[PDB]
Design a protein around this ligand. Sequence first.
Ligand SMILES: *[C@@H]1O[C@H](CO)[C@@H](O[C@@H]2O[C@H](CO)[C@@H](O[C@@H]3O[C@H](CO)[C@@H](O)[C@H](O[C@@H]4O[C@H](CO)[C@@H](O)[C@H](O)[C@@H]4O)[C@@H]3O)[C@H](O)[C@H]2NC(C)=O)[C@H](O)[C@H]1NC(C)=O
Ligand SMILES: *[C@@H]1O[C@H](CO)[C@@H](O[C@@H]2O[C@H](CO)[C@@H](O[C@@H]3O[C@H](CO)[C@@H](O)[C@H](O[C@H]4O[C@H](CO)[C@@H](O)[C@H](O)[C@@H]4O)[C@@H]3O)[C@H](O)[C@H]2NC(C)=O)[C@H](O)[C@H]1NC(C)=O
Ligand SMILES: *[C@@H]1O[C@H](CO)[C@@H](O[C@@H]2O[C@H](CO)[C@@H](O[C@@H]3O[C@H](CO)[C@@H](O)[C@H](O)[C@@H]3O)[C@H](O)[C@H]2NC(C)=O)[C@H](O)[C@H]1NC(C)=O
Ligand SMILES: *[C@@H]1O[C@H](CO)[C@@H](O[C@@H]2O[C@H](CO)[C@@H](O)[C@H](O)[C@H]2NC(C)=O)[C@H](O)[C@H]1NC(C)=O
Ligand SMILES: *[C@@H]1O[C@H](CO)[C@@H](O[C@@H]2O[C@H](CO)[C@@H](O)[C@H](O)[C@H]2NC(C)=O)[C@H](O)[C@H]1NC(C)=O
Ligand SMILES: c1cnc2cc3c(cc2n1)[C@@H]1CNC[C@H]3C1
Ligand SMILES: c1cnc2cc3c(cc2n1)[C@@H]1CNC[C@H]3C1
Ligand SMILES: c1cnc2cc3c(cc2n1)[C@@H]1CNC[C@H]3C1
Ligand SMILES: c1cnc2cc3c(cc2n1)[C@@H]1CNC[C@H]3C1
Ligand SMILES: c1cnc2cc3c(cc2n1)[C@@H]1CNC[C@H]3C1
Lengths: 212, 212, 212, 212, 212
Amino acid sequence: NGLMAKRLRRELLNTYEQLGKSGLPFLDDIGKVDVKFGLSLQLLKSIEQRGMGFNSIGTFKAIVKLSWVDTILRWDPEPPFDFQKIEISPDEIWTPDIKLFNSVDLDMTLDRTTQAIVFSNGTVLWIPPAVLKVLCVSQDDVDSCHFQFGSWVYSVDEVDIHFMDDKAEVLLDFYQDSLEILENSAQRQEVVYPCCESAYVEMKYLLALRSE
Amino acid sequence: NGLMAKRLRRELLNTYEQLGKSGLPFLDDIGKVDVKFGLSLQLLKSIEQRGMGFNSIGTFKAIVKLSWVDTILRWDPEPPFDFQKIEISPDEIWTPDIKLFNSVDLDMTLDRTTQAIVFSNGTVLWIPPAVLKVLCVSQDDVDSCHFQFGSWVYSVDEVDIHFMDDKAEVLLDFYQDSLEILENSAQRQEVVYPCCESAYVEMKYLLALRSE
Amino acid sequence: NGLMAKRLRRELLNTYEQLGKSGLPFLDDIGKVDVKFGLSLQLLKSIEQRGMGFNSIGTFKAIVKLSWVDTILRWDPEPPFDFQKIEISPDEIWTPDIKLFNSVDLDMTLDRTTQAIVFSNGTVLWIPPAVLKVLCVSQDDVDSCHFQFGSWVYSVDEVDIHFMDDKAEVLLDFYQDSLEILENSAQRQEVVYPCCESAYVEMKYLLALRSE
Amino acid sequence: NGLMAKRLRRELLNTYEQLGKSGLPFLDDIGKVDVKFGLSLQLLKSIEQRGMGFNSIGTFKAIVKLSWVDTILRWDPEPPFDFQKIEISPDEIWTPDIKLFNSVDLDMTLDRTTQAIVFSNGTVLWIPPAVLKVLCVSQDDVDSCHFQFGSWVYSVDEVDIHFMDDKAEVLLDFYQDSLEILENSAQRQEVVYPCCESAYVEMKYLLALRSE
Amino acid sequence: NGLMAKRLRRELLNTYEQLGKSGLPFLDDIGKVDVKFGLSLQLLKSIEQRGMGFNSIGTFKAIVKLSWVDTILRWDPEPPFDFQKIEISPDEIWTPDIKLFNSVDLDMTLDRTTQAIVFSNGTVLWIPPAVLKVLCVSQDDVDSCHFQFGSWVYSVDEVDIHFMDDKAEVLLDFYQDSLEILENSAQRQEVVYPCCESAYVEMKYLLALRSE
Ligand SMILES: *[C@@H]1O[C@H](CO)[C@@H](O[C@@H]2O[C@H](CO)[C@@H](O[C@@H]3O[C@H](CO)[C@@H](O)[C@H](O[C@@H]4O[C@H](CO)[C@@H](O)[C@H](O)[C@@H]4O)[C@@H]3O)[C@H](O)[C@H]2NC(C)=O)[C@H](O)[C@H]1NC(C)=O
Ligand SMILES: *[C@@H]1O[C@H](CO)[C@@H](O[C@@H]2O[C@H](CO)[C@@H](O[C@@H]3O[C@H](CO)[C@@H](O)[C@H](O[C@H]4O[C@H](CO)[C@@H](O)[C@H](O)[C@@H]4O)[C@@H]3O)[C@H](O)[C@H]2NC(C)=O)[C@H](O)[C@H]1NC(C)=O
Ligand SMILES: *[C@@H]1O[C@H](CO)[C@@H](O[C@@H]2O[C@H](CO)[C@@H](O[C@@H]3O[C@H](CO)[C@@H](O)[C@H](O)[C@@H]3O)[C@H](O)[C@H]2NC(C)=O)[C@H](O)[C@H]1NC(C)=O
Ligand SMILES: *[C@@H]1O[C@H](CO)[C@@H](O[C@@H]2O[C@H](CO)[C@@H](O)[C@H](O)[C@H]2NC(C)=O)[C@H](O)[C@H]1NC(C)=O
Ligand SMILES: *[C@@H]1O[C@H](CO)[C@@H](O[C@@H]2O[C@H](CO)[C@@H](O)[C@H](O)[C@H]2NC(C)=O)[C@H](O)[C@H]1NC(C)=O
Ligand SMILES: c1cnc2cc3c(cc2n1)[C@@H]1CNC[C@H]3C1
Ligand SMILES: c1cnc2cc3c(cc2n1)[C@@H]1CNC[C@H]3C1
Ligand SMILES: c1cnc2cc3c(cc2n1)[C@@H]1CNC[C@H]3C1
Ligand SMILES: c1cnc2cc3c(cc2n1)[C@@H]1CNC[C@H]3C1
Ligand SMILES: c1cnc2cc3c(cc2n1)[C@@H]1CNC[C@H]3C1
């Protein structure tokens, strides 16, 4: 019943509406959110030499894949709320503050008009298109670019991150370019920053392309 | 009477106001939406070569034609509501989340200030201008460009798509350019993705133009 | 001027706030809006050749003049609302959905922060600055550009358009450029489009400039 | 007391919240606003030749100085409200609709995130950074540009403007560039436009720079 | 406990929601805010010569670190509110109107989606990514750029600024680029402007880079 599904969504989001979306998605003991992160390269928009040196600005189109558990968004799918999943705007719920740390701009842009899917067990799946702009090195007809992703404010004890499906690499399931990929690797690291005390998960990707 | 036309719109949109626009547009049994989709090319803004290779970024101006049934928006056209249709803003109702998947930008942009028309039987007709930016291949004086569209989060059992008027081609009813069309074809496919275990409808268009 | 003027505004706008701005501006019998439309070229921002062919993107700065009657916004200029006119934001009242049909972008842009003036008899006068981008033919030291304007969703029976001051031409009352105008004419037509059965008013301007 | 300072703001703004920001800021009826206006050039962003002719688009960074009396925002500085002034967002009160009439874009841009200061007698001082884009003439190593400002919809009987501190020139109090200023004058005129009945104040500035 | 954390935030923010975020952050006697300010250069996006002279527009990516005390945001860290800190959105609280005075655009941009952290004694720590665009001098293979930061409307008796950790230099703790830094110094100045009577704190940074 369509009415019941919309009523369900309203009941679930009432918490976020009343208490706000800030803060880890827990009402009981504060736990650790483990985010599964995937980066799916679609295409290269441009690689533009910076001045006359060996560096360049690389602009990429990708699909970013995020999954995590939100215990506030759980329900028991017994009638009249027998729904396995519901679609939800990501601006109406908590979302991980994972940012492209080494963005040449403020951050990558994610398409936050795309909906997330939340399952009855509170697992959220959000797969936003993204534009990423980073500083690359262009030498010997190769463009080497790095991407570092991490939660802005939450340490490893608050927000953890692991490769979605344990695939430590740029994903090619949405790939739609003709570029020759010469390197494609990634690593998860727990990084201490000079400004701050505790450690933060960093997902670091290295992508090397043949120059056109 | 004008006031009655406005009260009708208010009465119809009350559901969306109280409950939000997320979720398939059904109040009773949740069915399948079937979107008729038409892509009407108007002009080419630019085709710009990427680096010194064979690919280029093609920027197009089009009109995207969408029609679907919203059962929430139905009325008996008996007086004093004897209106055949009413105009409504697309941001006050559910609209399909159809994205240009292979956009070089986050997505194509639709002019969401343009009104939709809704008829008394719940059929919605929305015809927004659109800007689309895709990767083309520019070889031997021919620019070949693909456009891939589909619902982001709804599978074929939830939101289906068919070509408007069953015309599987870029439509030329708004075409105002001087470019020579060398190929113009399109296919509807039900596609299974690695990430996800259901099939999604995709409309894939191929357009080839004589290069200027 | 004054709190009573503001109280007058609140009363006039209560209908639009309660009922919404969508729908023809008619209190009682729904009639036809007659829009008076004026296009006043101010200057050329740029004319940029498209690739290596004879077409170009011409970007213009203009002032667009619009007037129409809104019978909802009428009042008797008697104590204590003895005002001949008041200023109102265009986004608080119905406005004609008149679009630049052949825009290379989604539409021309109008400055919707500029206020409209409403007179006690319901006559609205709104004169927003505008930026217009269209495809021109640049041949033989002449740039020839067209502009096609019309209501997006309203047919001739619903919204009509006529040239302001009866001048079927681009108006030069705000012209501050040095370009030589070589051709300047316009036509009002009632047009049937392949998608739809009703006739829509189209205003088509032809402008031709000596090239720099 | 800091919370009393906030209570004062809330009480002052109550009127604007209840009645709206539109309309001249007299509490109430009869009155002419007199705006003091200053244009302080900070630097040249760029001058770009238009095509191959003698015209250019000049983009400038400036600080615009505005002051006027809002009689709605007056208070007696007696305890607990013994404040000589308070800060207020310009989007919470009426501001003059003073636009760059000859803008190549819709209008100059003002940083409306910057606060205004209001004194107890109702004097408002607002000093936003601004970006101004105009069409210049570039001949004989001189770039000559003009800037025209006026209220969009208010005539001289409604909104008047005078040069701040009676300085009829581009102010250099914030000048940080290296460009040689060759001419720098301004004139206040009362202008009748063909389109419209009344006279409107126009501050017309002339600035000539030695070309780099 | 998660609910308590959220209830605490809502309680702290209740003042800002009822009275507004404008005005200095003092529950009682209005005092002087002391802002600690750090600028961490991350990378150079571009240095673009302006015209054909010796000036250039430098666009930088940085991380701005800001800290001050907000007495409104204090709480006793006693059960059930035994939390050492909570994260809060900078758009729900007062933040210093610290602007890049010599910005070539309206201002530098800060990523205001990033969360601030507030400690129980009212100390707020906010570390937004930033894009800074300024005018530089490019002579003898050196690009010299200045950056001037200050509160826009608050004088020294209202908002003070001091260098974070008393390091009067551009900080290199997030520096990810290959450019050689030739000069790096900064000074805190109290400045009186011609336009206005009080003294304002200005943090002036000098950065010189080896040209590529
Ligand atoms: C609703 O209210 C509208 C606003 O008042 C009104 O619109 C205007 O109509 C007035 C009066 O007709 C117009 O003012 C005149 O414009 C014409 C042409 O520019 C002039 O010829 C005229 O001069 C008059 O000329 C006479 C001698 O030739 C002289 O004796 C008269 O004193 C007078 O000087 C006026 O200047 C004005 O342009 C209109 N304004 C706008 C914004 O449209 C509508 O007519 C009214 N609607 C209805 C249906 O009543
Ligand atoms: C309110 O709570 C906040 C958070 O707990 C608290 O701020 C913390 O204060 C400590 C101590 O001042 C700060 O620690 C400093 O960090 C910097 C660099 O990391 C050091 O330079 C400081 O050095 C100290 O030692 C110096 C010589 O070695 C001395 O010159 C100096 O005076 C210090 O003694 C010091 O280690 C810490 O940065 C903050 N924490 C955060 C995250 O803000 C604050 O003290 C409390 N405020 C009040 C008014 O009680
Ligand atoms: C309303 O209150 C405002 C704010 O106090 C008054 O404006 C201010 O007026 C004072 C007194 O004239 C000005 O001070 C003067 O400036 C000149 C020039 O530097 C100086 O030579 C004088 O000795 C004097 O100090 C001040 O500049 C001005 N401030 C601002 C920002 O406007 C205003 O006069 C009051 N209006 C009325 C009608 O009382
Ligand atoms: C929460 O429920 C969801 C949906 O049923 C579970 O997700 C699917 O799990 C199966 C089995 O591992 C996978 O094959 C699918 O890929 C998952 N679907 C999607 C779209 O994510 C999920 O595993 C459950 N979470 C927990 C904690 O068990
Ligand atoms: C709902 O009503 C609309 C409007 O009457 C129908 O659209 C008409 O459909 C017929 C048959 O397809 C077309 O020939 C006409 O062009 C349409 N009329 C207009 C004014 O557009 C629509 O078919 C109806 N939908 C259903 C499912 O019955
Ligand atoms: C509180 C607020 N902002 C932070 C920003 C950053 C960090 C910690 C923060 N803690 C380090 C880790 N994430 C990005 C930067 C550096
Ligand atoms: C839930 C949320 N987002 C999704 C995005 C996509 C898909 C499924 C999703 N499911 C696949 C189908 N549509 C676009 C991508 C790939
Ligand atoms: C309903 C919704 N959108 C429409 C768009 C157009 C038209 C009719 C529409 N009817 C024709 C007339 N105006 C522009 C295009 C074509
Ligand atoms: C009402 C609404 N808009 C107007 C725009 C202008 C004018 C009067 C208006 N009156 C003249 C003065 N200001 C700019 C243009 C021309
Ligand atoms: C009130 C409103 N705006 C101001 C802008 C500035 C100043 C004072 C202001 N006072 C001086 C200090 N801050 C920037 C400029 C110059």
